[PDB]
Design an enzyme around this catalytic site. Structure first.
Site, PDB file in Angstrom:
ATOM      1  N   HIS A  28      14.568  -7.096 -25.348  1.00 37.57           N
ATOM      2  CA  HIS A  28      13.363  -6.463 -24.833  1.00 37.57           C
ATOM      3  C   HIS A  28      12.321  -7.508 -24.450  1.00 37.57           C
ATOM      4  O   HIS A  28      11.732  -7.449 -23.367  1.00 37.57           O
ATOM      5  CB  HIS A  28      12.850  -5.517 -25.920  1.00 37.57           C
ATOM      6  CG  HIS A  28      11.705  -4.654 -25.510  1.00 37.57           C
ATOM      7  ND1 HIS A  28      10.398  -5.004 -25.759  1.00 37.57           N
ATOM      8  CD2 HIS A  28      11.663  -3.437 -24.918  1.00 37.57           C
ATOM      9  CE1 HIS A  28       9.597  -4.051 -25.320  1.00 37.57           C
ATOM     10  NE2 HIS A  28      10.339  -3.086 -24.809  1.00 37.57           N
ATOM     11  N   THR A  63       0.811  -1.213   0.000  1.00 37.59           N
ATOM     12  CA  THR A  63       0.000   0.000   0.000  1.00 37.59           C
ATOM     13  C   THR A  63       0.849   1.270   0.000  1.00 37.59           C
ATOM     14  O   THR A  63       0.287   2.365  -0.124  1.00 37.59           O
ATOM     15  CB  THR A  63      -0.949   0.011   1.206  1.00 37.59           C
ATOM     16  OG1 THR A  63      -0.232  -0.331   2.401  1.00 37.59           O
ATOM     17  CG2 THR A  63      -2.070  -0.992   0.998  1.00 37.59           C
ATOM     18  N   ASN A 117       5.359   5.805 -24.743  1.00 39.80           N
ATOM     19  CA  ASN A 117       6.390   6.594 -24.073  1.00 39.80           C
ATOM     20  C   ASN A 117       6.557   7.989 -24.663  1.00 39.80           C
ATOM     21  O   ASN A 117       7.667   8.509 -24.754  1.00 39.80           O
ATOM     22  CB  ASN A 117       7.722   5.862 -24.116  1.00 39.80           C
ATOM     23  CG  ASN A 117       7.636   4.467 -23.546  1.00 39.80           C
ATOM     24  OD1 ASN A 117       6.901   4.206 -22.591  1.00 39.80           O
ATOM     25  ND2 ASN A 117       8.368   3.551 -24.142  1.00 39.80           N
ATOM     26  N   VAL A 168      -9.164  -3.274 -24.176  1.00 39.82           N
ATOM     27  CA  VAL A 168      -8.009  -3.917 -23.561  1.00 39.82           C
ATOM     28  C   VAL A 168      -7.615  -3.145 -22.309  1.00 39.82           C
ATOM     29  O   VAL A 168      -8.254  -2.159 -21.946  1.00 39.82           O
ATOM     30  CB  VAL A 168      -6.851  -4.006 -24.562  1.00 39.82           C
ATOM     31  CG1 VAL A 168      -7.290  -4.760 -25.810  1.00 39.82           C
ATOM     32  CG2 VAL A 168      -6.324  -2.595 -24.896  1.00 39.82           C
ATOM     33  N   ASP A 190       6.425  -9.696 -28.677  1.00 38.13           N
ATOM     34  CA  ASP A 190       7.563  -8.790 -28.558  1.00 38.13           C
ATOM     35  C   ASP A 190       8.690  -9.249 -29.476  1.00 38.13           C
ATOM     36  O   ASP A 190       8.415  -9.707 -30.600  1.00 38.13           O
ATOM     37  CB  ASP A 190       7.998  -8.727 -27.086  1.00 38.13           C
ATOM     38  CG  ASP A 190       8.585  -7.412 -26.719  1.00 38.13           C
ATOM     39  OD1 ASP A 190       7.898  -6.611 -26.035  1.00 38.13           O
ATOM     40  OD2 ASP A 190       9.732  -7.173 -27.131  1.00 38.13           O
ATOM     41  N   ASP A 225      -6.150   2.474 -18.144  1.00 38.98           N
ATOM     42  CA  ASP A 225      -6.860   1.722 -17.122  1.00 38.98           C
ATOM     43  C   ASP A 225      -6.122   1.683 -15.792  1.00 38.98           C
ATOM     44  O   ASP A 225      -6.769   1.600 -14.743  1.00 38.98           O
ATOM     45  CB  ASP A 225      -7.107   0.296 -17.624  1.00 38.98           C
ATOM     46  CG  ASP A 225      -8.020   0.264 -18.853  1.00 38.98           C
ATOM     47  OD1 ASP A 225      -9.240   0.428 -18.689  1.00 38.98           O
ATOM     48  OD2 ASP A 225      -7.553   0.096 -19.999  1.00 38.98           O
ATOM     49  N   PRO A 266     -10.325   0.646 -26.592  1.00 39.20           N
ATOM     50  CA  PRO A 266     -10.946   0.738 -25.260  1.00 39.20           C
ATOM     51  C   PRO A 266     -11.033  -0.586 -24.507  1.00 39.20           C
ATOM     52  O   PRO A 266     -10.879  -0.604 -23.276  1.00 39.20           O
ATOM     53  CB  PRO A 266     -12.333   1.311 -25.568  1.00 39.20           C
ATOM     54  CG  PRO A 266     -12.215   1.939 -26.908  1.00 39.20           C
ATOM     55  CD  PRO A 266     -11.192   1.183 -27.656  1.00 39.20           C
ATOM     56  N   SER A 272       6.617  -0.234 -21.596  1.00 37.06           N
ATOM     57  CA  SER A 272       6.842  -1.636 -21.920  1.00 37.06           C
ATOM     58  C   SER A 272       7.209  -2.459 -20.700  1.00 37.06           C
ATOM     59  O   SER A 272       7.045  -3.678 -20.724  1.00 37.06           O
ATOM     60  CB  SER A 272       7.995  -1.769 -22.910  1.00 37.06           C
ATOM     61  OG  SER A 272       7.655  -1.239 -24.165  1.00 37.06           O
ATOM     62  N   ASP A 309      -2.736   7.805  -5.214  1.00 36.16           N
ATOM     63  CA  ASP A 309      -1.428   7.872  -4.574  1.00 36.16           C
ATOM     64  C   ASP A 309      -0.300   8.313  -5.502  1.00 36.16           C
ATOM     65  O   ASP A 309       0.837   8.455  -5.039  1.00 36.16           O
ATOM     66  CB  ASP A 309      -1.087   6.512  -3.953  1.00 36.16           C
ATOM     67  CG  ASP A 309      -2.073   6.108  -2.868  1.00 36.16           C
ATOM     68  OD1 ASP A 309      -2.430   6.979  -2.044  1.00 36.16           O
ATOM     69  OD2 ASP A 309      -2.497   4.930  -2.843  1.00 36.16           O
TER      70      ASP A 309
HETATM   71 CA   LIG Z   1      -9.555  -0.256 -21.316  1.00 33.66          CA
END
Ligand SMILES: [Ca+2]
Length: 279
Positions: free
Chosen positions: A69, A16, A161, A177, A39, A200, A175, A224, A260
């Site tokens: 990567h 937390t 990025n 995913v 990837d 999200d 939207p 990533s 936070d």
């Molecule tokens: Ca979403």
């Protein structure tokens, strides 16, 4: 379970509060789930994967990760030391070449591959896909990610990025995913992380230690790197029976640490992925 002196991002996932260094998690550790890492490939022979990783598809002359990567992302999903879900099965799909780039047609093909290939794998607890890639908006790329999610795979995608609104990037802007922004160890939005109402969730993305090619390890930064934390968390929660692939993004958002983070522009969620583990 408790892993001391864990990478900061693992510790943050189970805390937390910022500023701790132990990762706490249920010992089931994602066993019986599967995560596809779409990837540059995965160096499966790396001991940190303990035989749980394999390459299942490439669109290039080799399935070898010649970049690193994809191996780093896979390590954050499920390596023994650096991973969220330390017992998951890892499946590599090489849609990016060893310079880290890929044509959209190839990326689309790799997403459709996963939607079918999951029927060839044993993943009784559920299937996740981690997409640490992206480029400019493409409705075709978004549609492919939407199809993968509709097929019953929890799709986690990097926000990008560009320090910009993720609406202009794909598959980030699809939207349906789970679009993942990046945070740093002091609970700031990473300076490069995209933002916007399509996000999200945030995960750890600055200075993330994980596996690399040549049996090695290194720290690197990016959305990533945040994405595989969320993908691994989904696999972990699906093994625990807490959620399913269709519901996992909403579950993670509902159970996230809320309010936070700093440097969150107005209109962007202030939610940080959290496993809610109580020993
Ligand atoms: Ca979403």
């Amino acid at each position: 379970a408790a892993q001391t002196n864990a990478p900061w991002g693992l510790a943050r996932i189970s805390s937390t509060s910022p500023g701790t260094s132990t990762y706490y998690y249920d010992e089931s550790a994602g066993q019986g789930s599967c995560v596809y890492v779409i990837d540059t490939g995965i160096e499966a022979s790396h001991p940190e994967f303990e035989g749980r990783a394999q390459m299942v598809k490439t669109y290039y002359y080799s399935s070898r990760d010649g970049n690193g990567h994809g191996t780093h992302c896979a390590g954050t999903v499920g390596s023994r030391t650096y991973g969220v879900a330390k017992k998951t099965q890892l499946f590599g799909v090489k849609v990016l070449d060893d310079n880290g780039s890929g044509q959209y047609s190839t990326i689309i093909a790799g997403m459709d591959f996963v939607a079918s290939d999951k029927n060839n794998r044993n993943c009784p607890k559920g299937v996740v896909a981690s997409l640490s890639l992206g480029g400019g908006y493409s409705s075709s790329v978004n549609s492919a990610a939407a199809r993968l999610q509709s097929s019953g795979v929890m799709v986690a995608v990097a926000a990008g990025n560009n320090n910009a609104d993720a609406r202009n990037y794909s598959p980030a802007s699809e939207p349906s995913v789970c679009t993942v922004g990046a945070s740093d160890r002091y609970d700031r939005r990473s300076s490069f992380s995209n933002y916007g109402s399509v996000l999200d969730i945030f995960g750890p993305g600055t200075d993330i230690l994980s596996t690399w090619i040549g049996g090695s390890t290194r720290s690197i930064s990016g959305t990533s790197m945040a994405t595989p934390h969320v993908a691994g968390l989904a696999a972990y929660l699906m093994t625990l029976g807490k959620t399913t692939a269709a519901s996992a993004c909403r579950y993670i958002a509902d159970t996230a640490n809320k309010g936070d983070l700093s440097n969150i522009p107005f209109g962007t969620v202030n939610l940080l992925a959290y496993n809610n583990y109580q020993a």
